[PDB]
Design a protein around this ligand. Structure first.
Ligand SMILES: *[C@@H]1O[C@H](CO)[C@@H](O[C@@H]2O[C@H](CO)[C@@H](O[C@@H]3O[C@H](CO[C@H]4O[C@H](CO[C@H]5O[C@H](CO)[C@@H](O)[C@H](O)[C@@H]5O[C@H]5O[C@H](CO)[C@@H](O)[C@H](O)[C@@H]5O)[C@@H](O)[C@H](O[C@H]5O[C@H](CO)[C@@H](O)[C@H](O)[C@@H]5O)[C@@H]4O)[C@@H](O)[C@H](O[C@H]4O[C@H](CO)[C@@H](O)[C@H](O)[C@@H]4O[C@H]4O[C@H](CO)[C@@H](O)[C@H](O)[C@@H]4O[C@H]4O[C@H](CO)[C@@H](O)[C@H](O)[C@@H]4O)[C@@H]3O)[C@H](O)[C@H]2NC(C)=O)[C@H](O)[C@H]1NC(C)=O
Ligand SMILES: *[C@@H]1O[C@H](CO)[C@@H](O[C@@H]2O[C@H](CO)[C@@H](O[C@@H]3O[C@H](CO[C@H]4O[C@H](CO[C@H]5O[C@H](CO)[C@@H](O)[C@H](O)[C@@H]5O[C@H]5O[C@H](CO)[C@@H](O)[C@H](O)[C@@H]5O)[C@@H](O)[C@H](O[C@H]5O[C@H](CO)[C@@H](O)[C@H](O)[C@@H]5O)[C@@H]4O)[C@@H](O)[C@H](O[C@H]4O[C@H](CO)[C@@H](O)[C@H](O)[C@@H]4O[C@H]4O[C@H](CO)[C@@H](O)[C@H](O)[C@@H]4O[C@H]4O[C@H](CO)[C@@H](O)[C@H](O)[C@@H]4O)[C@@H]3O)[C@H](O)[C@H]2NC(C)=O)[C@H](O)[C@H]1NC(C)=O
Ligand SMILES: *[C@@H]1O[C@H](CO)[C@@H](O[C@@H]2O[C@H](CO)[C@@H](O[C@@H]3O[C@H](CO[C@H]4O[C@H](CO)[C@@H](O)[C@H](O[C@H]5O[C@H](CO)[C@@H](O)[C@H](O)[C@@H]5O)[C@@H]4O)[C@@H](O)[C@H](O[C@H]4O[C@H](CO)[C@@H](O)[C@H](O)[C@@H]4O[C@@H]4O[C@H](CO)[C@@H](O)[C@H](O)[C@@H]4O)[C@@H]3O)[C@H](O)[C@H]2NC(C)=O)[C@H](O)[C@H]1NC(C)=O
Ligand SMILES: *[C@@H]1O[C@H](CO)[C@@H](O[C@@H]2O[C@H](CO)[C@@H](O[C@@H]3O[C@H](CO[C@H]4O[C@H](CO)[C@@H](O)[C@H](O[C@H]5O[C@H](CO)[C@@H](O)[C@H](O)[C@@H]5O)[C@@H]4O)[C@@H](O)[C@H](O[C@H]4O[C@H](CO)[C@@H](O)[C@H](O)[C@@H]4O[C@@H]4O[C@H](CO)[C@@H](O)[C@H](O)[C@@H]4O)[C@@H]3O)[C@H](O)[C@H]2NC(C)=O)[C@H](O)[C@H]1NC(C)=O
Ligand code: NAG
Ligand code: NAG
Ligand code: NAG
Ligand code: NAG
Ligand code: NAG
Ligand code: NAG
Ligand code: NAG
Ligand code: NAG
Ligand code: NAG
Ligand code: NAG
Ligand code: NAG
Ligand code: NAG
Ligand code: NAG
Ligand code: NAG
Ligand code: NAG
Ligand code: FRU
Ligand code: FRU
Lengths: 624, 624
């Protein structure tokens, strides 16, 4: 095993465990110290204002198993510190008959058991578990634990009658899944149900959704309500909140609803951020965010979606969330988005970016798998004075339209996402910032034009505004992680409305994924404008490429170039002419970003272990 | 619920949990503080000379489940003190994927991991588990833990390759069971295998048996040898030590070998006690003790047996234990005997006495189930100068015979059992002792003759020597726990060779078992004697009646009389005449015995709990 990044890569499968630990590793984002991670969990703002982030964790392994909560904290979403206790950076782990198969996703009741922060999580036991298997009741239940030390440790309620698990009965038969309890307060839902509480007797101030579906009949999000305020054992099933069809799709802008939901959450937003009104705010919109399974041919069969919903009260004292419009939270290799409330009327969302090594060829050599996305403020994005001749505008697919009185302009409403400002400020302030001169892309434009200043490593951010003619057929964007032989191309093509990431040349190492990523982006044309603009922000962080367009469209993906000098970046141009020009302005390179884990050394591997021959006997975990 | 023991019992099923806690409860023996107990486990003499006793334990329940090691200690086998730690009196409990279904029986390596006492135990996980089910590999494995604090706590080795569990591969397919590792040193087996160690490479100084069987083809005791001295991970399967047939019986004196072994152990004894020679002691005999399942119509389908064996070395470097003669360790409601070495060349054996409430009618009202037997010294019982006209003597069923040179006398050899002398001394010294005048039972004998001194409660011991004519048809014995309306009759009938416990009148409460207990006892007639003698010792301890005959035959059973005055005792006589007389001598009553748990209050119940609806979902434990 040679680690010479000045020549072509050898057979890297001969390299030892964690020998490629630093080679492709993100430095500027949330990631476990080592080993396997997946979904964010247990997210909450602590009493001191800091952020507690949990995650599904399997230390010293590179596949899922014995799934536990790893945890860390931060005062700014950006610079983090690991917890360190008797189980290292773990704070909840399989320990009881009811959760021995895995401590799955859970969410936080801030004022819970004895007034302490309390997690409601999916406790798993034995038996077939999965949307395509014949799962039985009891395999997935929901259990409580609380912390007396601000997340350094958690104490589970005892096992038994009137204790853990607290939710165990399936609300309907033949479930495809029954997990990921999302606990939330909702003045909105309380107001809607206030006249029906005699029917159910559920009067608590916390609601909980559980994600799943029904075999052969599509996904389901089940709504529970805390039976009595201040009491956390009894949760009353109201009814299905979201019901979708078996592999139903709302269309090209909306992914596919698959057969089963995972990590679903419920929020209410307005243009500024989180909305906590009872329905009285006419600018507020109710949203559900959710993953779906088995409705996608690639990306691990997983869509991270969202939907704007209108709540209707059923006669039995439950709520139907009727989907008004439906979109995609991220178009690339990410999933398991969780959102949580943050002080100052914010709702912040974060997901998991998986690797692109689905055949597990170099996972052991990495010594880790997975990272988070960046943390994102959610809000209602409102675009005013939109031209009615914007192509496809009245499809109203992942947005809504309201006509002006005179019919000459439209107000567009959709889900907004933007990187939390704490991270943008810290990134910029710790980077070497190059403000670049605007570039007009015309007949003289090369295919690729390097920026006048270049990155020094694989940790940087790019921004640019691309102004296109209303009838352009030109394409433009950014090339990143680029040398002569390796590069990743991010293109926008207004004619097709497609943002793509072409990865055919991303790496000389042939075992990584190389499929082209694709997102739809609607450039809402403004009344009186003779052009349309794409604002593109790109974060390059080890192997992560995370793309944001117009504070709306997100696409996370992976690139693993071998050569040490595959770090360059610049502008891409295709079919730009004297007549069909693309004006690029607001160009800026931030080189360096932030060291997100300042207390960690460069190599936090502790080696990898094998569970031994019993792993196959038990049949629950891969074992490595 | 009335607790008036001066009148007939009401409907006791209306009584609350643990309301009958003290009513029938033993006071003078090893018993858990409350709840369910079964098999002794983890038995060893500690460095300070005290005895550590573990037991299968399910606190706050009255059926088996979440099975754990409860523990206590004693300097004299007789007066005990509970451990008290973070889990009360438990010291090992289900905590890992490999043992989450139960910490089953295990035994002690005195100089184990890092020189500490170390337990090898059966770690159980999910799946069908049982001799009549389709069990699969992995459900029962064998794991290690060690103690740095003389049994107050145990530290398990980690889960994984080269760690726990240390034995997981089934030595043959379609096992009925794979549990109860019994670790022992054996100069005998080492000498026998010394010429074959090239074939197996196993040269360690510890052996281990694992108890089981093969579906459709009878029980098996599998022999393993520690691969290397001072190393505890690698154990090498040599071969089957004991192989018996599907429900094979050696006859009327030997129970039935059933379909599966449990709690089997291996020892070597001589007339004085334990023998640690390499084979050079011609007075020493190799013994296996073992439980069998599904070879009995009652007593929970369970026989506690023993066999004298002659070891043969196989060509593949393993040992066949050929059964020479075969007997019964206890004929009544006991099972799961364990033996362990004790200083001064002793091997001490102790078992579990279950209740006689198999339909679980008053278990909750008790608030506990189970106790130990008394602790018993094992030795080779030798009877010299036996008359060749002793009926049935050359059947050699659970004994051996060697003729004198002249053929006029026989030496009989069998397994001896007697209560450890520490317990007999403590019992006698703490009791009010009445030495009773000898009684000749003839034509004047009533059916029942009370002793001249009577017990004051349900805690006493009786002794007597019953001298019978060689052709008697008379029966005699002891009545215990007796009032006019309730009593338990212990009869010996030399003509049939049957010792019986008749329990048709044991209690006015009709839900308890009332079947007649039966043991075979061979009165070895001595050359020149004109009579034959039965030495009977009986312990009455709450509901336990534990009977010993001639330091050989043991029979443990249960009686639950309701009336406060059903405590009396005396002599039984049937068919005694002027000509057929039974001479009773050596009569003694010990009233009171010992308070075996002096630090415990009278009521150590902590209440009972229900596991809730998930118990049936998981399907592993009853849940109460
Ligand atoms: C199979 O068997 C298994 C083993 O038995 C069994 O698992 C066990 O289940 C039991 C029962 O559910 C659990 O017991 C609970 O424990 C809770 C605390 O748990 C935390 O702490 C313990 C102990 O920690 C000590 O010891 C450890 C280990 O040595 C040390 O490392 C610690 O530092 C600490 O040491 C100190 O203390 C020791 C003495 O205890 C000293 O020896 C030592 O020197 C130190 O000073 C840990 O072991 C736990 O760890 C385990 O669990 C965590 C997850 O929780 C895992 O991550 C970890 O790996 C371990 O597995 C853990 O950290 C108790 O809080 C709880 O007691 C309460 O509940 C019961 C009711 O259920 C009440 O009876 C009791 O009164 C308590 O309730 C009161 O208190 C709470 C708040 O404190 C209130 O909310 C509540 O209302 C109530 O208040 C009452 O009193 C108030 C007055 O004070 C009053 O105001 C109120 O009005 C009210 O009256 C309970 O004891 C046990 O932890 C499990 N153990 C393990 C190892 O799993 C399993 O379930 C069985 N399975 C089946 C299928 O049956
Ligand atoms: C799913 O995830 C699960 C959770 O991660 C996982 O279970 C965990 O598995 C790991 C890995 O196997 C276990 O880790 C081992 O722990 C052993 C000790 O275990 C005992 O102590 C711990 C910790 O106790 C502290 O904390 C608790 C809880 O708060 C307190 O109550 C205690 O009082 C104590 O607190 C003090 O210390 C804390 C810091 O740790 C402080 O915070 C605190 O302030 C106090 O000061 C307990 O938690 C354990 O309890 C659990 O387990 C018991 C059964 O064992 C249960 O009954 C109970 O309910 C709990 O479940 C327990 O009591 C370690 O000994 C062990 O470390 C050794 O092994 C590894 C190799 O495997 C080596 O890397 C390491 O070096 C150690 O080996 C050396 O040392 C031993 C002797 O000590 C030697 O024999 C050995 O050769 C070696 O020697 C070396 O060094 C020498 C120099 O010193 C040198 O001479 C030699 O040459 C050599 O080089 C390991 O860390 C962990 O316990 C499990 N946890 C739980 C909760 O289950 C599970 O397996 C996963 N499942 C799957 C399927 O994957
Ligand atoms: C005395 O000690 C007991 C512990 O032994 C302790 O707890 C009680 O334990 C008993 C079992 O011994 C439990 O009985 C079972 O109850 C089930 C129904 O339970 C529901 O109704 C109850 C009555 O109002 C409620 O009290 C229950 O509430 C508790 O539990 C819920 C969780 O479900 C919790 O949220 C609450 O907070 C409470 O803690 C609950 O709503 C019965 O289904 C179960 O019935 C079976 O067993 C009976 C007896 O054999 C049979 O009559 C039935 O036919 C059925 O049995 C069959 O069982 C066989 C073998 O199991 C099987 O093959 C068949 O399929 C079928 O199941 C049983 O009756 C009792 O619920 C529980 N009470 C609790 C937790 O409060 C007591 O509390 C303790 N007393 C005191 C004063 O301390
Ligand atoms: C680097 O990190 C690893 C942890 O990832 C760590 O431990 C090693 O982990 C790998 C897995 O990643 C283990 O490989 C497996 O080994 C099995 C055979 O193992 C036996 O032979 C080995 C070779 O000499 C021995 O080293 C082993 O000894 C150890 O374990 C025993 C317990 O068994 C213990 O007593 C010892 O003390 C040692 O700890 C052992 O005797 C293979 O069966 C298994 O093979 C499968 O997977 C391969 C790779 O994909 C395939 O080629 C095979 O076809 C087969 O895979 C198929 O798998 C799929 C999915 O699993 C399934 O559908 C099929 O049925 C089939 O199974 C695999 O190769 C390795 O044993 C283990 N080594 C250990 C513990 O020492 C390394 O130690 C670490 N390195 C360093 C330097 O730290
Ligand atoms: C980058 O490195 C490769 C291999 O060392 C080399 O061929 C190339 O010329 C280098 N410089 C570039 C692409 O600017
Ligand atoms: C890479 O090495 C592996 C052994 O780890 C070997 O099986 C494989 O064929 C090698 N690839 C080549 C030579 O291209
Ligand atoms: C569907 O549900 C019932 C239990 O409610 C169960 O008997 C059945 O096996 C389930 N699965 C299928 C494939 O029908
Ligand atoms: C309430 O009604 C809805 C619609 O029929 C149904 O899906 C839900 O299960 C009902 N809730 C119950 C039975 O608790
Ligand atoms: C919205 O505006 C467009 C263009 O002016 C028009 O075609 C459409 O009918 C209008 N919708 C409503 C509800 O007035
Ligand atoms: C650098 O990053 C840290 C950690 O996020 C942040 O607190 C600090 O303000 C940044 N430095 C600047 C903006 O100069
Ligand atoms: C065409 O592009 C080049 C490079 O940006 C620029 O120098 C030139 O001015 C552009 N042409 C026009 C007409 O603006
Ligand atoms: C743009 O994307 C869609 C998928 O939404 C695809 O069907 C279409 O062919 C693409 N068009 C072009 C020109 O790339
Ligand atoms: C024993 O008690 C019962 C009921 O109180 C009574 O009938 C009997 O005479 C008492 N005394 C005896 C049997 O000596
Ligand atoms: C017997 O053994 C094999 C595995 O060795 C297994 O396939 C089979 O199902 C077992 N049980 C029966 C009843 O044959
Ligand atoms: C040794 O031989 C015996 C008798 O054939 C056999 O039962 C045992 O399994 C053998 N041991 C092995 C294969 O390790
Ligand atoms: C043992 O003694 C009996 C009676 O004297 C006799 O029948 C039998 O043959 C003797 N056995 C041997 C082996 O000599
Ligand atoms: C009473 O019993 C205790 C505990 O077993 C024992 O140590 C003591 O010697 C006994 N008293 C006597 C024999 O007087
Ligand atoms: C018969 O028994 C009675 C009571 O034990 C006794 O007094 C009497 O002496 C016995 N008869 C003979 C002949 O010994
Ligand atoms: C004595 O016990 C045996 C069982 O070993 C039984 O078959 C026989 O009938 C009994 N005989 C009498 C007289 O009780
Ligand atoms: O690690 C298990 C967790 O990951 C998910 O499957 C999402 O990928 C959740 O539904 C579950 O709680
Ligand atoms: O409690 C389980 C234990 O009890 C036994 O079944 C004997 O009755 C053992 O074989 C086992 O280890």
């Amino acid at each position: 095993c040679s680690l010479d990044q000045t020549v072509a890569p050898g057979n890297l499968t001969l390299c030892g465990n964690a020998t490629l630990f630093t080679t492709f590793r993100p430095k500027a984002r949330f990631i476990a110290p080592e080993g396997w991670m997946n979904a964010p969990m247990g997210l909450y703002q602590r009493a001191d204002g800091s952020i507690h982030a949990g995650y599904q964790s399997h230390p010293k392994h590179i596949q899922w198993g014995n799934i536990s909560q790893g945890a860390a904290y931060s005062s700014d979403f950006t610079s983090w510190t690991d917890f360190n206790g008797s189980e290292g950076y773990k704070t909840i782990w399989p320990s009881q008959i009811y959760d021995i198969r895995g401590v799955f996703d859970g969410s936080i009741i801030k004022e819970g058991i004895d007034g302490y922060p309390t997690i409601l999580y999916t406790s798993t036991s034995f038996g077939p578990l999965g949307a395509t298997l014949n799962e039985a009741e009891g395999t997935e239940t929901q259990s409580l634990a609380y912390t007396t030390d601000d997340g350094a440790s958690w104490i589970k309620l005892g096992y038994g009658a009137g204790q853990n698990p607290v939710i165990y009965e399936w609300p309907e038969t033949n479930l495809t899944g029954f997990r990921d309890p999302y606990v939330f307060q909702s003045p909105r839902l309380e107001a809607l149900l206030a006249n029906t509480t005699s029917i159910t007797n559920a009067t608590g101030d916390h609601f909980a959704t559980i994600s799943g579906g029904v075999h052969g009949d599509g996904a389901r999000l089940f709504l529970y309500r805390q039976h009595t305020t201040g009491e956390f054992i009894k949760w009353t099933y109201l009814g299905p909140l979201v019901t979708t069809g078996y592999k139903e799709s709302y269309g090209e802008w909306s992914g596919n609803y698959g057969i089963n939901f995972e990590t679903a959450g419920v929020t209410r937003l307005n243009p500024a951020g989180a909305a906590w009104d009872n329905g009285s705010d006419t600018t507020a919109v109710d949203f559900v965010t959710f993953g779906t399974e088995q409705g996608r041919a690639d990306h691990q069969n997983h869509w991270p979606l969202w939907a704007a919903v209108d709540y209707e009260v059923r006669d039995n004292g439950s709520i139907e969330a009727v989907i008004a419009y439906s979109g995609v939270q991220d178009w690339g290799r990410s999933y398991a988005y969780a959102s949580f409330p943050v002080e100052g009327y914010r709702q912040v969302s974060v997901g998991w970016i998986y690797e692109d090594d689905d055949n597990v060829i170099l996972a052991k050599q990495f010594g880790y798998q997975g990272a988070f996305t960046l943390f994102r403020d959610l809000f209602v994005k409102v675009v005013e004075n939109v031209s009615p001749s914007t192509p496809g505008l009245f499809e109203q697919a992942s947005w809504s339209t309201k006509n002006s009185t005179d019919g000459m302009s439209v107000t567009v409403t959709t889900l907004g996402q933007r990187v939390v400002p704490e991270t943008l400020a810290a990134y910029k302030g710790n980077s070497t910032v190059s403000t670049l001169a605007p570039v007009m892309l015309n007949e003289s434009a090369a295919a690729y034009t390097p920026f006048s200043s270049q990155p020094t490593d694989r940790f940087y951010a790019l921004t640019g505004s691309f102004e296109f003619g209303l009838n352009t057929t030109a394409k433009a964007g950014f090339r990143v992680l680029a040398s002569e032989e390796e590069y990743t191309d991010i293109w926008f093509d207004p004619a097709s409305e497609n943002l793509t990431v072409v990865r055919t040349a991303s790496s000389l190492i042939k075992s990584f994924g190389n499929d082209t990523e694709l997102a739809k982006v609607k450039l809402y044309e403004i009344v009186g404008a003779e052009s349309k603009t794409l604002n593109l922000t790109v974060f390059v962080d080890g192997s992560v490429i995370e793309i944001y367009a117009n504070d709306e469209v997100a696409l996370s993906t992976r690139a693993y170039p071998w050569l040490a000098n595959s770090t360059g970046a610049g502008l891409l141009a295709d079919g730009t002419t004297a007549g069909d020009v693309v004006g690029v302005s607001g160009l800026e390179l931030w080189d360096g970003l932030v060291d997100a884990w300042p207390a960690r050394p460069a190599n936090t591997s502790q080696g990898l272990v094998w569970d031994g021959p019993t792993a196959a006997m038990y049949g629950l975990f891969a074992g490595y």
